[PDB]
Design a protein around this nucleic acid. Sequence first.
RNA 1: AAGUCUGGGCUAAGUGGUAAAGGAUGUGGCGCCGCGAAGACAGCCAGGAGGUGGCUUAGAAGCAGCCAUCCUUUAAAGAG
RNA 2: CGAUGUCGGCUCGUCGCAUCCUGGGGCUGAAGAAGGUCCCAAGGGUUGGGCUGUUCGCCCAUUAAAGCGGCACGCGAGCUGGGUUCAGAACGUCGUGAGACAGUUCGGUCUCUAUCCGCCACGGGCGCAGGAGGCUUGAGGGGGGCUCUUCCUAGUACGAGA
RNA 3: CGCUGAAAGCAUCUAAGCGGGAAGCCCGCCCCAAGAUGAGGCCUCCCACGGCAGCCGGUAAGGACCCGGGAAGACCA
Lengths: 4, 204, 174, 122, 37
Amino acid sequence: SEAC
Amino acid sequence: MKGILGVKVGMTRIFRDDRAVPVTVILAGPCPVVQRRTPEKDGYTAVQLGFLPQNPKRVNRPLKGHFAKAGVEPVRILREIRDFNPEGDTVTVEIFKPGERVDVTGTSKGRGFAGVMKRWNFAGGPDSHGAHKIHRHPGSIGNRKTPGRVYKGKKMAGHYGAERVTVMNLEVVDVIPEENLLLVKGAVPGPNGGLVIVRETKKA
Amino acid sequence: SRIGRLPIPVPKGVSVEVAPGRVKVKGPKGELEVPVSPEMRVVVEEGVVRVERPSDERRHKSLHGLTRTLIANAVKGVSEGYSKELLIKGIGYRARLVGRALELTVGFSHPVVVEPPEGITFEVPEPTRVRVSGIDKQKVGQVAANIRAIRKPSAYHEKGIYYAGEPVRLKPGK
Amino acid sequence: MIQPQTYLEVADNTGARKIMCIRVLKGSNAKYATVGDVIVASVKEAIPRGAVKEGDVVKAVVVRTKKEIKRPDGSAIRFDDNAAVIINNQLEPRGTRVFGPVARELREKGFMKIVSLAPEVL
Amino acid sequence: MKVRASVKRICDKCKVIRRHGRVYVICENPKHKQRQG
RNA sequence: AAGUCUGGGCUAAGUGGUAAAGGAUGUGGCGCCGCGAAGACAGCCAGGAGGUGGCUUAGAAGCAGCCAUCCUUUAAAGAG
RNA sequence: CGAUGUCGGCUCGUCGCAUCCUGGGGCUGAAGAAGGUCCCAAGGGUUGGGCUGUUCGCCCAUUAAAGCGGCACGCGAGCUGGGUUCAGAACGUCGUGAGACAGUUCGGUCUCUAUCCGCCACGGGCGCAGGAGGCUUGAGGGGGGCUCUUCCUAGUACGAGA
RNA sequence: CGCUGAAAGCAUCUAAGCGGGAAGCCCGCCCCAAGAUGAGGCCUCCCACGGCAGCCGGUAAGGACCCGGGAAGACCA
Ligand SMILES: [Mg+2]
Ligand SMILES: [Mg+2]
Ligand SMILES: [Mg+2]
Ligand SMILES: [Mg+2]
Ligand SMILES: [Mg+2]
Ligand SMILES: [Mg+2]
Ligand SMILES: [Mg+2]
Ligand SMILES: [Mg+2]
Ligand SMILES: [Mg+2]
Ligand SMILES: [Mg+2]
Ligand SMILES: [Mg+2]
Ligand SMILES: [Mg+2]
Ligand SMILES: [Mg+2]
Ligand SMILES: [Mg+2]
Ligand SMILES: [Mg+2]
Ligand SMILES: [Mg+2]
Ligand SMILES: [Mg+2]
Ligand SMILES: [Mg+2]
Ligand SMILES: [Mg+2]
Ligand SMILES: [Mg+2]
Ligand SMILES: [Mg+2]
Ligand SMILES: [Mg+2]
Ligand SMILES: [Mg+2]
Ligand SMILES: [Mg+2]
Ligand SMILES: [Mg+2]
Ligand SMILES: [Mg+2]
Ligand SMILES: [Mg+2]
Ligand SMILES: [Mg+2]
Ligand SMILES: [Mg+2]
Ligand SMILES: [Mg+2]
Ligand SMILES: [Mg+2]
Ligand SMILES: [Mg+2]
Ligand SMILES: [Mg+2]
Ligand SMILES: [Mg+2]
Ligand SMILES: [Mg+2]
Ligand SMILES: [Mg+2]
Ligand SMILES: [Mg+2]
Ligand SMILES: [Mg+2]
Ligand SMILES: [Mg+2]
Ligand SMILES: [Mg+2]
Ligand SMILES: [Mg+2]
Ligand SMILES: [Mg+2]
Ligand SMILES: [Mg+2]
Ligand SMILES: [Mg+2]
Ligand SMILES: [Mg+2]
Ligand SMILES: [Mg+2]
Ligand SMILES: [Mg+2]
Ligand SMILES: [Mg+2]
Ligand SMILES: [Mg+2]
Ligand SMILES: [Mg+2]
Ligand SMILES: [Mg+2]
Ligand SMILES: [Mg+2]
Ligand SMILES: [Mg+2]
Ligand SMILES: [Mg+2]
Ligand SMILES: [Mg+2]
Ligand SMILES: [Mg+2]
Ligand SMILES: [Mg+2]
Ligand SMILES: [Mg+2]
Ligand SMILES: [Mg+2]
Ligand SMILES: [Mg+2]
Ligand SMILES: [Mg+2]
Ligand SMILES: [Mg+2]
Ligand SMILES: [Mg+2]
Ligand SMILES: [Mg+2]
Ligand SMILES: [Mg+2]
Ligand SMILES: [Mg+2]
Ligand SMILES: [Mg+2]
Ligand SMILES: [Mg+2]
Ligand SMILES: [Mg+2]
Ligand SMILES: [Mg+2]
Ligand SMILES: [Mg+2]
Ligand SMILES: [Mg+2]
Ligand SMILES: [Mg+2]
Ligand SMILES: [Mg+2]
Ligand SMILES: [Mg+2]
Ligand SMILES: [Mg+2]
Ligand SMILES: [Mg+2]
Ligand SMILES: [Mg+2]
Ligand SMILES: [Mg+2]
Ligand SMILES: [Mg+2]
Ligand SMILES: [Mg+2]
Ligand SMILES: [Mg+2]
Ligand SMILES: [Mg+2]
Ligand SMILES: [Mg+2]
Ligand SMILES: [Mg+2]
Ligand SMILES: [Mg+2]
Ligand SMILES: [Mg+2]
Ligand SMILES: [Mg+2]
Ligand SMILES: [Mg+2]
Ligand SMILES: [Mg+2]
Ligand SMILES: [Mg+2]
Ligand SMILES: [Mg+2]
Ligand SMILES: [Mg+2]
Ligand SMILES: [Mg+2]
Ligand SMILES: [Mg+2]
Ligand SMILES: [Mg+2]
Ligand SMILES: [Mg+2]
Ligand SMILES: [Mg+2]
Ligand SMILES: [Mg+2]
Ligand SMILES: [Mg+2]
Ligand SMILES: [Mg+2]
Ligand SMILES: [Mg+2]
Ligand SMILES: [Mg+2]
Ligand SMILES: [Mg+2]
Ligand SMILES: [Mg+2]
Ligand SMILES: [Mg+2]
Ligand SMILES: [Mg+2]
Ligand SMILES: [Mg+2]
Ligand SMILES: [Mg+2]
Ligand SMILES: [Mg+2]
Ligand SMILES: [Mg+2]
Ligand SMILES: [Mg+2]
Ligand SMILES: [Mg+2]
Ligand SMILES: [Mg+2]
Ligand SMILES: [Mg+2]
Ligand SMILES: [Mg+2]
Ligand SMILES: [Mg+2]
Ligand SMILES: [Mg+2]
Ligand SMILES: [Mg+2]
Ligand SMILES: [Mg+2]
Ligand SMILES: [Mg+2]
Ligand SMILES: [Mg+2]
Ligand SMILES: [Mg+2]
Ligand SMILES: [Mg+2]
Ligand SMILES: [Mg+2]
Ligand SMILES: [Mg+2]
Ligand SMILES: [Mg+2]
Ligand SMILES: [Mg+2]
Ligand SMILES: [Mg+2]
Ligand SMILES: [Mg+2]
Ligand SMILES: [Zn+2]
């Protein structure tokens, strides 16, 4: 995940 | 409704009115009748047919008793043709005339364990542009938490061919009574030497 | 104001018998049979048939009127008979009999051959008039309706199959 | 076996020298055109002052194919190029001459004028 | 046939009937044929 | 688990067993006018006329725009 | 929040019907042909390409038609990684400055092994009151379900003509 | 869309009854299928063997094991  | 047990021989093309006609040659008869299914006894109408003589020293006692009630030689194969009560006790290629349409049932060629591309004509994945070891893979098999499962009858990999296949409405090109030969325009299921069942057509 | 209390005149010599939920009408041209509600009462008098309803509830009043006309239509059918006439119209439209069957020439690429059911007799006086004849009133009307349907009156022109007595109403075109 | 992107030589004196098929006018989604089929195409090369110029979207009928077409007598025929003749919406040739042999299939498909202008029907 | 929730008479030859559980308006004028729904 | 329990009534939509404005000869029960044997309502048998139509417009003369829709022989007839 | 991976695409389907086409209809300000509007209908079908990461949208050439939505904006333990979304760099802008910007620009580590459910296939076991070798009935399931062009009828019906 | 037809003297495809009517629904076509435990049916073969619905050994019609292979197949079948 790179939930930005 | 009428039928006969055959052997697939091979393919060729003959010439009829300056046209090339691909054919499959079938060694149909002769099929002696071994037993008759009646509505009084069994509940339906059919003929049990014999095909190919067999080494009498190869057919056990239960089967020999069966052949004796009909007074016939040992035959290699026994198959029923439903809704057919022929007059005689023997069925030969001459129940068909050239110009009639027939259906033929054989056992297709067996591909063993077949991938989804050969089994179901799937499209695979790309062969470049980053594709990462999915070149022949089925893709996605579902959705997410709803329904959270995989449909029955989902197209996947697995065994293929060596299954009963009927092709329907083939034109009988010629009949050669002297050799028990039956000619049929087009392609018939299975390999040369495979057993096939030839029936009068059902398409009107 | 009441159909079902109107007595039914019966001509000489027509037979009328009463049965459970049935009555049978035997006359000069044959015999019909009218199925009646058990809730009604068919009573035979001197050359007269009457129908009596048990209460004044709406189902009894509705079967009452219905039932009287059913008996009367059958008794007229076995004596006098029923018929319906059709006028064909058009520049190329005509018809003829072929045996007992009815062949129509009415503008298709083919003719249309109508066969008469049991109890129905066809007849073509002139190539443009057709008559349906039988004892059963409802059946004579169904046969006539079917024949008409094959080529209905045109909305804009006076061609098609018309009931005798049917008005010719048309609308313009430009 | 002509499909979109396929280049075709021009077997006539219309002025066009090469055309690029853009559509197979045979149904909703024919994959391939053969002999006797009509395509839509773009003129990619012309000779000057011809009846057609570069950048024209025209009609044409395929008269020769490198993929060999088969026949009911069991024979087949195969040409060295892929060639077509430019037509108008009445299937008639828009030029006055037809260069090279054409297939006999064009006759059945109703392109009789091209066939007669052809120097050899094979 | 018009299909709507407000089926009404349109002219004095319009007739409001009920057959097979549905309300209809039938009439000599074919534009006036109505069914509720 | 314990009533196919007792009596009066309603519903025909499986309504009951998920919704509104609004629409309806669904059905049952009330109320209030009108008209009627001074023969009504329906149907039918009838008569259904005329001066004759005027701005209108090559005519709209019952049956294109208008103008008021005037009289009448009459049991009644609309210059529709 | 001791982690429910986030756009689009590809692959693979499946469902709804407020139906884009094909089938059946009523009305028409429906002559014919061709349309408009509404009703029934979810069986099948619903193309290839240019541009942009795009969804969407416009455009080219077709078509019977080029439907609209749902399934974690269906589907990254199935793939991609163009976008978005760290660390480098730069432009416009803002800040004295350090730095900042759903503003732009170029680049940027996406994890061999499936335990249980589910799915595709294939066997082993026992059962079907004696034990066997054959041949079968079909409860119940699954597959399939599209559609166009030309000709004849007939240049007739219809229409001044087209 | 009808035929016949009241309630409602007329009218009404409906309340009693009867028609016509979709690429859709049922069957019909192709394939799987009696673990269909509701485990079906027909033809044919063996049979009452020896020791205290059970028991353990020798047999029956038959089957398996092994081996030569197979357009059958991952092994198995
Ligand atoms: Mg060979
Ligand atoms: Mg020959
Ligand atoms: Mg076989
Ligand atoms: Mg095989
Ligand atoms: Mg093969
Ligand atoms: Mg294999
Ligand atoms: Mg594969
Ligand atoms: Mg395949
Ligand atoms: Mg395959
Ligand atoms: Mg393949
Ligand atoms: Mg691909
Ligand atoms: Mg692809
Ligand atoms: Mg590939
Ligand atoms: Mg590769
Ligand atoms: Mg990678
Ligand atoms: Mg990788
Ligand atoms: Mg991988
Ligand atoms: Mg690779
Ligand atoms: Mg998940
Ligand atoms: Mg996901
Ligand atoms: Mg679930
Ligand atoms: Mg297999
Ligand atoms: Mg198959
Ligand atoms: Mg054929
Ligand atoms: Mg075979
Ligand atoms: Mg064999
Ligand atoms: Mg009819
Ligand atoms: Mg040249
Ligand atoms: Mg040349
Ligand atoms: Mg030029
Ligand atoms: Mg240029
Ligand atoms: Mg240029
Ligand atoms: Mg040309
Ligand atoms: Mg020549
Ligand atoms: Mg309104
Ligand atoms: Mg009416
Ligand atoms: Mg009780
Ligand atoms: Mg209801
Ligand atoms: Mg309910
Ligand atoms: Mg309900
Ligand atoms: Mg969280
Ligand atoms: Mg944890
Ligand atoms: Mg956790
Ligand atoms: Mg996460
Ligand atoms: Mg975690
Ligand atoms: Mg986790
Ligand atoms: Mg791709
Ligand atoms: Mg979908
Ligand atoms: Mg709908
Ligand atoms: Mg239609
Ligand atoms: Mg349609
Ligand atoms: Mg017109
Ligand atoms: Mg039309
Ligand atoms: Mg319409
Ligand atoms: Mg409608
Ligand atoms: Mg559909
Ligand atoms: Mg769809
Ligand atoms: Mg390019
Ligand atoms: Mg693109
Ligand atoms: Mg785009
Ligand atoms: Mg989106
Ligand atoms: Mg956009
Ligand atoms: Mg169209
Ligand atoms: Mg279009
Ligand atoms: Mg597209
Ligand atoms: Mg969607
Ligand atoms: Mg969609
Ligand atoms: Mg949702
Ligand atoms: Mg959303
Ligand atoms: Mg969102
Ligand atoms: Mg997604
Ligand atoms: Mg996803
Ligand atoms: Mg990933
Ligand atoms: Mg993704
Ligand atoms: Mg996932
Ligand atoms: Mg995952
Ligand atoms: Mg996964
Ligand atoms: Mg997961
Ligand atoms: Mg995958
Ligand atoms: Mg990137
Ligand atoms: Mg961007
Ligand atoms: Mg600056
Ligand atoms: Mg500051
Ligand atoms: Mg400042
Ligand atoms: Mg500054
Ligand atoms: Mg930034
Ligand atoms: Mg941003
Ligand atoms: Mg930001
Ligand atoms: Mg911006
Ligand atoms: Mg940027
Ligand atoms: Mg920049
Ligand atoms: Mg960037
Ligand atoms: Mg680089
Ligand atoms: Mg990258
Ligand atoms: Mg790895
Ligand atoms: Mg596992
Ligand atoms: Mg894996
Ligand atoms: Mg589990
Ligand atoms: Mg498992
Ligand atoms: Mg097993
Ligand atoms: Mg058993
Ligand atoms: Mg047994
Ligand atoms: Mg057995
Ligand atoms: Mg049985
Ligand atoms: Mg069977
Ligand atoms: Mg079944
Ligand atoms: Mg089951
Ligand atoms: Mg279909
Ligand atoms: Mg003609
Ligand atoms: Mg004609
Ligand atoms: Mg009527
Ligand atoms: Mg009637
Ligand atoms: Mg009446
Ligand atoms: Mg009824
Ligand atoms: Mg019916
Ligand atoms: Mg029917
Ligand atoms: Mg069809
Ligand atoms: Mg079977
Ligand atoms: Mg069994
Ligand atoms: Mg079986
Ligand atoms: Mg049991
Ligand atoms: Mg049991
Ligand atoms: Mg049992
Ligand atoms: Mg059960
Ligand atoms: Mg058994
Ligand atoms: Mg093996
Ligand atoms: Mg082996
Ligand atoms: Mg092994
Ligand atoms: Mg092996
Ligand atoms: Mg072994
Ligand atoms: Zn009206």
